[PDB]
């Protein structure tokens, strides 16, 4: 039920975080050059 | 050299859309099963 919800949304927030740091990586190397 | 570690980088944010991507569709997956 909601705990599974719950399971789910911690696994997007997760991804989401380490989505914007691939994103600042990506931004640091492109202003490194 | 430069371009590879740009590269690089661009595959694993590639990477990272694509597995928010997917932990997006298991949470409308499970509100769907509800």
């Not at 039920?1 to 911690?10: D, L, N, P, Y």
């Not at 380490?18 to 931004?27: G, N, S, T």
């Amino acid at each position: 039920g909601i705990a599974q919800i719950i399971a789910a949304q911690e696994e997007m927030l997760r991804k989401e975080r380490e989505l914007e740091e691939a994103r600042k990586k990506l931004a640091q190397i492109r202003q490194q050059q």
